[PDB]
Amino acid sequence: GEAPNQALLRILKETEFKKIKVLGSGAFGTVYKGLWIPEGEKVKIPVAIKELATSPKANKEILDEAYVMASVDNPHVCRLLGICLTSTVQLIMQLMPFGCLLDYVREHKDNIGSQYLLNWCVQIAKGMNYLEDRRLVHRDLAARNVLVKTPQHVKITDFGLAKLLGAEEGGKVPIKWMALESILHRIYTHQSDVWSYGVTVWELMTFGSKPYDGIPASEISSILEKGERLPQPPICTIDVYMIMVKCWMIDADSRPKFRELIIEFSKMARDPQRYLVIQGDERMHLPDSNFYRALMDEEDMDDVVDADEYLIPQ
Numbered sequence: 001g002e003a004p005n006q007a008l009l010r011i012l013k014e015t016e017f018k019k020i021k022v023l024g025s026g027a028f029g030t031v032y033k034g035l036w037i038p039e040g041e042k043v044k045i046p047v048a049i050k051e052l053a054t055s056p057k058a059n060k061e062i063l064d065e066a067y068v069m070a071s072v073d074n075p076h077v078c079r080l081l082g083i084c085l086t087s088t089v090q091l092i093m094q095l096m097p098f099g100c101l102l103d104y105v106r107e108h109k110d111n112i113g114s115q116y117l118l119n120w121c122v123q124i125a126k127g128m129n130y131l132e133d134r135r136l137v138h139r140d141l142a143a144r145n146v147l148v149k150t151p152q153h154v155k156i157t158d159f160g161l162a163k164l165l166g167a168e169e170g171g172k173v174p175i176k177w178m179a180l181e182s183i184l185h186r187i188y189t190h191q192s193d194v195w196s197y198g199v200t201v202w203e204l205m206t207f208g209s210k211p212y213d214g215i216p217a218s219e220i221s222s223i224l225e226k227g228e229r230l231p232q233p234p235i236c237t238i239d240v241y242m243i244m245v246k247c248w249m250i251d252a253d254s255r256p257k258f259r260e261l262i263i264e265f266s267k268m269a270r271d272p273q274r275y276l277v278i279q280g281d282e283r284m285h286l287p288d289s290n291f292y293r294a295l296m297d298e299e300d301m302d303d304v305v306d307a308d309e310y311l312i313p314q
């Protein structure tokens with residue numbers, strides 16, 4: 001008994017969009033950086049195209065991802081522009097130039113400011129909170145999953161795992177980000193996500209260090225029971241770490257709600273220096289020119305517009 005889903009699904013012709021380069025290869029599918037032009041639009045929008053090939057088993061997963069992505073719209077949640085029904089179904093999405101946050105943090109670990117990390121934490125919370133609002137449980141929150149539209153702006157992604165809160169329900173599951181209740185009982189909840197959220201913040205705070213490094217996955221479930229947990233990061237103040245710790249509490253109801261996380265981090269954002277300690281944050285900067293876009297896609301960019309401006313969803 002739920003409200004009807006009226007989300008609009010858009011079908012896009014292959015002729016309209018041309019792939020430029022490959023971001024990653026899944027063997028099953030690869031994602032290509034690309035430019036999409038609507039016919040008689042006189043606009044070019046940067047997008048990423050995902051290819052499943054044509055194995056029948058594969059398609060249901062491919063489309064399911066499409067069904068969830070189409071349904072949800074938020075600034076901090078990744079946007080699906082449409083799909084193309086070619087011999088192999090193609091998924092078209094807004095392109096984040098700077099890529100996954102997890103990679104980004106590592107590239108720029110020296111140059112990343114105190115303010116940015118706190119701001120990223122708020123952005124992630126907003127996006128997750130909205131999903132919670134939608135009653136959609138991500139089921140897989142990770143640093144790699146979050147993507148950077150710009151250093152200032154980041155959005156969530158990888159919804160294939162994601163399932164509705166109501167619903168009862170190679171072959172790889174990441175234990176480390178998974179909440180304890182989930183690991184023992186395969187239980188997933190928004191509260192479950194928060195635990196996933198805490199790890200993600202740990203990744204940012206630790207600048208992409210792998211969690212529980214050198215630890216067998218099998219071991220971890222036991223370790224959690226003891227109450228052992230990830231170490232406080234060097235940069236982190238107690239105020240920040242405690243917030244992370246609360247996420248990891250065994251009793252889910254106890255873990256901080258997402259809306260609170262936005263609030264707690266936002267206050268911290270006002271005075272970044274006080275909460276997080278890093279050497280010379282005050283004199284650090286990171287990257288918007290059309291010419292740069294030309295560098296990105298090696299093409300004239302006079303008419304280029306981004307999906308957010310163009311999509312104007314709603």
Ligand SMILES: C=CC(=O)Nc1cccc(Oc2nc(Nc3ccc(N4CCN(C)CC4)cc3OC)ncc2Cl)c1
Pocket residue numbers: 023024031033048093094095096097098099100103144145147
């Ligand atoms: C699981 C980590 C990961 O690489 N995820 C990933 C990788 C490639 C593409 C991807 O999906 C997207 N990626 C992007 N942007 C993007 C992603 C990764 C990258 N890189 C940049 C080069 N790096 C070595 C590999 C990943 C670059 C991107 O924009 C230039 N935009 C939209 C989507 Cl849907 C996710």
